[PDB]
Tab-separated table of N, CA and C in Angstrom:
chain	number	residue	atom	x	y	z
A	1	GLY	N	87.967	68.864	91.758
A	1	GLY	CA	88.283	69.287	93.101
A	1	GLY	C	87.719	70.701	93.183
A	2	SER	N	88.393	71.395	94.283
A	2	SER	CA	88.269	72.844	94.363
A	2	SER	C	86.817	73.506	95.043
A	3	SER	N	86.015	72.348	95.214
A	3	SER	CA	84.651	72.519	95.773
A	3	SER	C	84.017	71.285	96.322
A	4	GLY	N	82.991	71.370	97.271
A	4	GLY	CA	82.434	70.248	97.933
A	4	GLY	C	80.990	70.481	97.936
A	5	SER	N	80.072	69.309	97.898
A	5	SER	CA	78.630	69.282	97.816
A	5	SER	C	77.988	69.440	99.269
A	6	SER	N	78.806	69.052	100.312
A	6	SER	CA	78.258	69.054	101.816
A	6	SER	C	79.205	69.884	102.755
A	7	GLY	N	80.045	70.659	102.165
A	7	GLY	CA	80.945	71.480	102.807
A	7	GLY	C	82.028	72.200	102.104
A	8	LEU	N	83.124	72.526	102.780
A	8	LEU	CA	84.266	73.286	102.358
A	8	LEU	C	85.470	73.167	103.041
A	9	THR	N	86.767	73.483	102.633
A	9	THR	CA	88.036	73.439	103.342
A	9	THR	C	88.170	74.611	104.336
A	10	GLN	N	89.252	74.493	105.023
A	10	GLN	CA	89.710	75.646	105.968
A	10	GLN	C	90.427	76.919	105.351
A	11	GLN	N	90.312	76.936	104.009
A	11	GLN	CA	90.951	78.076	103.200
A	11	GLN	C	90.343	79.447	103.469
A	12	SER	N	89.074	79.461	104.073
A	12	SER	CA	88.443	80.703	104.500
A	12	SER	C	89.095	81.635	105.322
A	13	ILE	N	90.369	81.438	105.836
A	13	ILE	CA	91.315	82.169	106.630
A	13	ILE	C	92.018	83.446	105.688
A	14	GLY	N	91.658	83.250	104.247
A	14	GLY	CA	92.088	84.238	103.383
A	14	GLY	C	91.132	85.414	103.302
A	15	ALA	N	90.679	85.820	102.111
A	15	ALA	CA	89.735	87.015	101.850
A	15	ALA	C	88.353	86.182	101.312
A	16	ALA	N	88.323	85.392	100.260
A	16	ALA	CA	87.262	84.849	99.663
A	16	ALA	C	86.778	83.621	100.694
A	17	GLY	N	85.539	83.498	100.865
A	17	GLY	CA	84.811	82.646	101.781
A	17	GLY	C	84.922	83.038	103.328
A	18	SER	N	85.631	84.140	103.641
A	18	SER	CA	85.875	84.522	104.911
A	18	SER	C	84.902	85.340	105.648
A	19	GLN	N	84.760	85.394	106.954
A	19	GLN	CA	83.706	86.090	107.767
A	19	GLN	C	84.356	87.063	108.753
A	20	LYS	N	85.462	87.341	108.769
A	20	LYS	CA	86.313	88.583	109.497
A	20	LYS	C	85.790	89.856	108.956
A	21	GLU	N	86.233	90.992	109.549
A	21	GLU	CA	85.995	92.289	109.147
A	21	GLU	C	86.951	93.310	109.598
A	22	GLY	N	87.216	94.429	108.805
A	22	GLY	CA	88.142	95.486	109.202
A	22	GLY	C	87.491	96.500	110.177
A	23	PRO	N	88.065	97.732	110.267
A	23	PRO	CA	87.669	98.762	111.135
A	23	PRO	C	86.117	99.173	110.736
A	24	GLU	N	85.495	99.792	111.765
A	24	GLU	CA	84.054	100.239	111.488
A	24	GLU	C	83.922	101.440	110.494
A	25	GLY	N	82.985	100.994	109.350
A	25	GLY	CA	82.843	101.778	108.154
A	25	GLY	C	83.540	101.101	106.890
A	26	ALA	N	84.443	100.216	107.293
A	26	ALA	CA	85.122	99.325	106.048
A	26	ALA	C	84.335	98.117	105.747
A	27	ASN	N	83.032	98.052	106.138
A	27	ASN	CA	82.248	96.810	106.028
A	27	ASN	C	81.090	96.921	105.169
A	28	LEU	N	80.878	96.126	104.149
A	28	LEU	CA	80.030	96.340	103.040
A	28	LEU	C	79.043	95.166	102.737
A	29	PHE	N	77.769	95.254	102.443
A	29	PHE	CA	76.894	94.352	101.942
A	29	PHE	C	76.520	94.597	100.556
A	30	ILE	N	76.541	93.710	99.709
A	30	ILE	CA	76.353	93.764	98.160
A	30	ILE	C	75.181	92.983	97.761
A	31	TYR	N	74.243	93.546	96.903
A	31	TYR	CA	73.055	92.853	96.440
A	31	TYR	C	72.781	92.995	94.888
A	32	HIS	N	71.864	91.934	94.391
A	32	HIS	CA	71.683	91.877	93.028
A	32	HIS	C	72.609	91.270	92.270
A	33	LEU	N	73.609	90.362	92.861
A	33	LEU	CA	74.712	89.603	92.218
A	33	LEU	C	74.145	88.413	91.351
A	34	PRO	N	74.740	88.094	90.165
A	34	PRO	CA	74.412	87.045	89.329
A	34	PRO	C	74.420	85.713	90.068
A	35	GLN	N	73.704	84.672	89.518
A	35	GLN	CA	73.462	83.437	90.204
A	35	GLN	C	74.785	82.463	90.070
A	36	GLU	N	75.716	83.000	89.050
A	36	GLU	CA	77.009	82.302	88.846
A	36	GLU	C	78.075	82.871	89.597
A	37	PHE	N	77.916	83.871	90.360
A	37	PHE	CA	79.026	84.701	91.234
A	37	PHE	C	79.285	83.828	92.398
A	38	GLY	N	80.495	83.423	92.711
A	38	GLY	CA	80.935	83.093	94.050
A	38	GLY	C	81.841	83.959	94.774
A	39	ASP	N	82.432	83.503	95.991
A	39	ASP	CA	83.292	84.327	96.844
A	39	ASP	C	84.475	84.853	96.153
A	40	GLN	N	85.049	84.147	95.238
A	40	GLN	CA	86.098	84.526	94.387
A	40	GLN	C	85.920	85.619	93.392
A	41	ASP	N	84.704	85.597	92.782
A	41	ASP	CA	84.199	86.430	91.928
A	41	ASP	C	83.913	87.825	92.508
A	42	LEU	N	83.119	87.833	93.738
A	42	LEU	CA	82.918	88.983	94.435
A	42	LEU	C	84.391	89.741	94.964
A	43	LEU	N	85.393	88.799	95.303
A	43	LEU	CA	86.623	89.244	95.709
A	43	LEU	C	87.301	89.980	94.447
A	44	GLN	N	87.424	89.351	93.284
A	44	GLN	CA	88.038	89.991	92.129
A	44	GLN	C	87.346	91.178	91.643
A	45	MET	N	86.025	91.336	91.874
A	45	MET	CA	85.307	92.402	91.539
A	45	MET	C	85.488	93.708	92.527
A	46	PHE	N	85.947	93.430	93.777
A	46	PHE	CA	86.175	94.451	94.795
A	46	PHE	C	87.670	94.723	95.052
A	47	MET	N	88.585	93.972	94.576
A	47	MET	CA	90.017	94.179	94.537
A	47	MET	C	90.466	95.551	94.021
A	48	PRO	N	89.861	96.195	93.001
A	48	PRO	CA	90.387	97.442	92.416
A	48	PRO	C	90.223	98.597	93.236
A	49	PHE	N	89.467	98.607	94.322
A	49	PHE	CA	89.131	99.853	95.233
A	49	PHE	C	90.111	99.835	96.550
A	50	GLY	N	90.821	98.748	96.741
A	50	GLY	CA	91.919	98.601	97.770
A	50	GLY	C	92.070	97.328	98.325
A	51	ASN	N	92.753	97.120	99.642
A	51	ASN	CA	93.052	96.079	100.282
A	51	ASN	C	91.929	95.287	100.998
A	52	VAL	N	91.379	94.347	100.208
A	52	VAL	CA	90.118	93.558	100.720
A	52	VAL	C	90.614	92.584	101.858
A	53	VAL	N	90.122	92.576	102.975
A	53	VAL	CA	90.273	91.629	104.203
A	53	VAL	C	89.377	90.358	104.107
A	54	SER	N	88.056	90.709	103.621
A	54	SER	CA	87.146	89.589	103.556
A	54	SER	C	86.080	89.699	102.336
A	55	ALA	N	85.684	88.665	101.612
A	55	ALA	CA	84.672	88.766	100.656
A	55	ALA	C	84.024	87.297	100.725
A	56	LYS	N	82.591	87.457	100.584
A	56	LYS	CA	81.655	86.349	100.822
A	56	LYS	C	80.465	86.347	100.065
A	57	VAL	N	79.951	85.311	99.542
A	57	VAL	CA	78.580	85.154	98.848
A	57	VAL	C	77.841	84.106	99.627
A	58	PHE	N	76.503	84.491	100.059
A	58	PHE	CA	75.606	83.586	100.939
A	58	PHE	C	74.945	82.572	99.931
A	59	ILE	N	74.765	81.399	100.502
A	59	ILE	CA	74.281	80.176	99.641
A	59	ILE	C	73.024	79.650	100.292
A	60	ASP	N	71.940	79.479	99.519
A	60	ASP	CA	70.666	78.803	100.020
A	60	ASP	C	70.840	77.236	100.149
A	61	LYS	N	70.500	76.821	101.266
A	61	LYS	CA	70.735	75.408	101.766
A	61	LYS	C	69.737	74.601	101.232
A	62	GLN	N	68.750	74.849	100.524
A	62	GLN	CA	67.823	74.060	99.669
A	62	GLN	C	68.278	73.746	98.222
A	63	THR	N	68.971	74.586	97.567
A	63	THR	CA	69.323	74.531	96.146
A	63	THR	C	70.814	74.548	95.990
A	64	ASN	N	71.771	74.849	96.930
A	64	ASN	CA	73.066	75.166	96.901
A	64	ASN	C	73.499	76.300	95.875
A	65	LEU	N	72.565	77.252	95.437
A	65	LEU	CA	72.617	78.367	94.724
A	65	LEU	C	72.923	79.671	95.479
A	66	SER	N	73.705	80.715	94.978
A	66	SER	CA	73.868	81.855	95.732
A	66	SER	C	72.559	82.696	95.785
A	67	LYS	N	72.429	83.502	96.870
A	67	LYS	CA	71.164	84.193	97.341
A	67	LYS	C	71.137	85.604	96.665
A	68	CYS	N	72.013	85.800	95.609
A	68	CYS	CA	72.054	87.114	94.827
A	68	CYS	C	72.659	88.153	95.833
A	69	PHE	N	73.245	87.895	96.917
A	69	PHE	CA	73.813	89.093	97.842
A	69	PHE	C	74.997	88.292	98.617
A	70	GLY	N	75.840	89.280	99.123
A	70	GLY	CA	77.114	88.946	99.458
A	70	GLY	C	77.684	90.087	100.593
A	71	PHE	N	78.895	89.970	101.124
A	71	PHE	CA	79.510	90.759	102.125
A	71	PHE	C	81.036	90.983	101.624
A	72	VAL	N	81.570	92.200	101.868
A	72	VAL	CA	82.915	92.413	101.718
A	72	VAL	C	83.587	93.359	102.727
A	73	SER	N	84.785	93.260	103.161
A	73	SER	CA	85.453	94.140	104.143
A	73	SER	C	86.824	94.435	103.714
A	74	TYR	N	87.290	95.770	104.088
A	74	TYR	CA	88.591	96.321	103.639
A	74	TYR	C	89.499	96.436	104.825
A	75	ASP	N	90.722	96.836	104.797
A	75	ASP	CA	91.708	97.183	105.710
A	75	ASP	C	91.401	98.553	106.227
A	76	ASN	N	90.617	99.392	105.300
A	76	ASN	CA	90.536	100.966	105.629
A	76	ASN	C	88.992	101.382	105.233
A	77	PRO	N	88.348	102.156	105.888
A	77	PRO	CA	86.966	102.701	105.491
A	77	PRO	C	87.003	103.524	104.044
A	78	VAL	N	88.104	104.049	103.773
A	78	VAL	CA	88.172	104.906	102.524
A	78	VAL	C	88.223	103.966	101.247
A	79	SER	N	88.995	102.885	101.390
A	79	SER	CA	88.955	101.757	100.218
A	79	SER	C	87.496	101.132	100.040
A	80	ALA	N	86.800	101.065	101.178
A	80	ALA	CA	85.499	100.592	101.132
A	80	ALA	C	84.282	101.619	100.628
A	81	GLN	N	84.509	102.804	100.970
A	81	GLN	CA	83.728	104.007	100.425
A	81	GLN	C	83.903	104.175	99.055
A	82	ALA	N	85.122	103.874	98.487
A	82	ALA	CA	85.561	103.938	97.043
A	82	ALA	C	84.807	102.776	96.243
A	83	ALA	N	84.701	101.591	96.912
A	83	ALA	CA	83.821	100.580	96.175
A	83	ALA	C	82.288	100.988	96.185
A	84	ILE	N	81.703	101.347	97.405
A	84	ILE	CA	80.342	101.918	97.267
A	84	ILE	C	80.074	102.883	96.182
A	85	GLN	N	81.070	103.910	96.024
A	85	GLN	CA	80.940	104.977	94.945
A	85	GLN	C	81.247	104.486	93.471
A	86	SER	N	81.675	103.150	93.407
A	86	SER	CA	82.105	102.675	91.992
A	86	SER	C	81.039	101.603	91.601
A	87	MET	N	80.475	100.900	92.556
A	87	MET	CA	79.675	99.699	92.356
A	87	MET	C	78.227	99.740	92.747
A	88	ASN	N	77.681	100.781	93.486
A	88	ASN	CA	76.343	101.133	93.836
A	88	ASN	C	75.704	101.623	92.565
A	89	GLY	N	74.860	100.853	91.821
A	89	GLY	CA	74.243	101.135	90.511
A	89	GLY	C	74.847	100.524	89.335
A	90	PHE	N	75.918	99.727	89.478
A	90	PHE	CA	76.695	99.047	88.389
A	90	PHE	C	75.872	98.065	87.686
A	91	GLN	N	75.583	98.121	86.378
A	91	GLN	CA	74.861	97.347	85.621
A	91	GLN	C	75.606	96.150	85.140
A	92	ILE	N	75.144	94.777	85.498
A	92	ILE	CA	75.557	93.621	85.074
A	92	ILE	C	74.529	92.696	84.450
A	93	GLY	N	74.426	92.556	83.105
A	93	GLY	CA	73.358	92.051	82.331
A	93	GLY	C	72.324	92.977	82.228
A	94	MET	N	71.095	92.531	82.664
A	94	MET	CA	69.773	93.254	82.534
A	94	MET	C	69.392	93.902	83.770
A	95	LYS	N	70.113	93.902	84.826
A	95	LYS	CA	69.867	94.493	86.209
A	95	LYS	C	71.061	95.340	86.708
A	96	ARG	N	71.036	95.955	87.866
A	96	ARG	CA	71.903	96.774	88.589
A	96	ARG	C	72.209	96.428	89.974
A	97	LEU	N	73.611	96.266	90.301
A	97	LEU	CA	74.035	96.103	91.767
A	97	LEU	C	73.694	97.155	92.701
A	98	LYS	N	73.433	96.702	94.085
A	98	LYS	CA	73.335	97.743	95.117
A	98	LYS	C	74.350	97.464	96.154
A	99	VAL	N	75.112	98.461	96.787
A	99	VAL	CA	76.087	98.260	97.876
A	99	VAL	C	75.738	99.302	98.861
A	100	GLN	N	75.906	98.778	100.203
A	100	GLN	CA	75.666	99.599	101.422
A	100	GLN	C	76.549	99.256	102.422
A	101	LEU	N	76.840	100.169	103.350
A	101	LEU	CA	77.438	99.830	104.657
A	101	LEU	C	76.651	98.783	105.654
A	102	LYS	N	77.348	98.248	106.575
A	102	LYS	CA	76.860	97.240	107.470
A	102	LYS	C	75.794	97.972	108.504
A	103	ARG	N	74.654	97.513	108.464
A	103	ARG	CA	73.584	98.002	109.469
A	103	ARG	C	73.824	97.344	110.779
A	104	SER	N	73.679	98.216	112.053
A	104	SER	CA	73.982	97.693	113.329
A	104	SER	C	73.288	98.682	114.270
A	105	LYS	N	73.186	98.437	115.671
A	105	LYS	CA	72.914	99.226	116.754
A	105	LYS	C	73.686	100.534	116.985
A	106	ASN	N	73.138	101.456	117.438
A	106	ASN	CA	73.704	102.848	117.804
A	106	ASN	C	73.261	103.571	119.113
A	107	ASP	N	73.921	104.442	119.608
A	107	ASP	CA	73.696	105.035	120.957
A	107	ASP	C	74.289	106.522	120.989
A	108	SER	N	75.485	106.697	120.369
A	108	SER	CA	76.069	108.030	120.422
A	108	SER	C	75.491	108.893	119.288
A	109	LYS	N	74.409	108.364	118.518
A	109	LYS	CA	73.726	109.050	117.409
A	109	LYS	C	72.350	108.265	117.205
A	110	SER	N	71.339	108.985	116.849
A	110	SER	CA	70.018	108.529	116.548
A	110	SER	C	69.744	107.792	115.269
A	111	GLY	N	70.694	107.889	114.320
A	111	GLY	CA	70.448	107.226	113.009
A	111	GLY	C	71.446	107.532	111.987
A	112	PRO	N	71.371	107.166	110.794
A	112	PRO	CA	72.430	107.428	109.653
A	112	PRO	C	72.340	108.912	109.267
A	113	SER	N	71.280	109.650	109.313
A	113	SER	CA	71.226	111.079	109.025
A	113	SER	C	71.028	111.427	107.527
A	114	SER	N	70.875	110.412	106.714
A	114	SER	CA	70.855	110.418	105.277
A	114	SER	C	70.157	109.029	104.790
A	115	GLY	N	69.731	109.107	103.536
A	115	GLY	CA	69.125	108.011	102.816
A	115	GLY	C	68.513	108.356	101.448
């Protein structure tokens, strides 16, 4: 049990497998993940930095493998910024993770002002 070859259960109302998000700036995208990491492995990796609202790993529809990237979101922006400052550059085997804020449109400002 615990997984399907053609779908999944309605249990994505929790954190792992979920696609909700918290307040603006509490929303993270994570890259260079292991091919064995699922939505619960990304959740357990990001729990140490505060109250996680959602955690997700994206899946390739031709192989059913993870795309080596995911999403995470918190109840507060400070819990999220603490995860960027702890996990961006984290070595896992022979490579390093990258973590960034959610990219989107802007109008009250011309860009992120740093990079």
